[PDB]
């Protein structure tokens, strides 16, 4: 019998993403343009307190997908209100966490968690057991597409320094807000070479109004370009399905 292996246990939690043919940047820009043109009706129909934020439960699902590793010294980059840091603190205590964010957003997590008020694009890395990053922003419709792409590429370039240091993080959870840019795909491929690990996932039930994926330190899953292509094609189809009659 399959036994306990049944519970971990991928089927329910993330999209199946086998690689397919196509240009992910062209397809991503196409579906973003279509979404920008949607009516209130269309857009609304598919755009759809215990914790410091809704991020706590999200990180719990991701860490379970990773077989619940021991976290050790952890940096939480772009910590915001602290949902991810609070999860780490509940798991292992406050001592091993450093939270980095621009609080200029107020901290809703344990005040015992060490915090650094800094731009993650300026802060230089240090050696950690676990690297967490939940930065990234979806832009509103009125703006040009390349602006959103460049903003999120810049954040990813900040994470790159943490990943490429001489002793990289053993565990990592990296939010990829815009995964179909040339830079995002090149960065993910590079981190797979550096670490020998890493799989890009789309979480089931994430909002269709965004293009968010998560890069997780589970076993290597390669062909990232084709899997992003599959993701953006399927996303455009599910946006169409939801926005319609
Ligand atoms: N360049 C930057 N440096 C530091 N923090 C940033 C930067 N850009 C955005 N942020 C912050 O990153 C946060 C992103 C949030 N999604 C984090 C949520 C957090 N994971 C939670 O569970 O509550 C926002 O609070 C932003 O204020």
Residue numbers in the entry: 38 to 85, 95 to 150, 154 to 294
What text comes from the article?
Sinefungin (SIN), an analogue of the methyl-donor SAM, is originally isolated from Streptomyces griseoleus as a potential antifungal antibiotic. It contains a C-NH2 group to replace the S-CH3 group of SAM and has been previously identified as a potent inhibitor of flavivirus MTases. As expected, SIN readily binds to the ALSV enzyme, showing an affinity (12.6 ± 2.8 μM) that is similar to those observed with SAM and SAH. The structure was solved with Rwork and Rfree values of 0.198 and 0.226, respectively. The electron density for the bound SIN molecule was clearly observed in the SAM/SAH-binding pocket. Its binding was stabilized via a series of hydrogen-bond interactions, involving the MTase residues S99, G129, W130, L148, N168, V169 and D183.
Alongshan virus (ALSV), a newly discovered member of unclassified Flaviviridae family, is able to infect humans. ALSV NSP1 is a typical flavivirus NS5-like protein. The flaviviral NS5-MTase functions to catalyze the methylation of viral RNA cap.
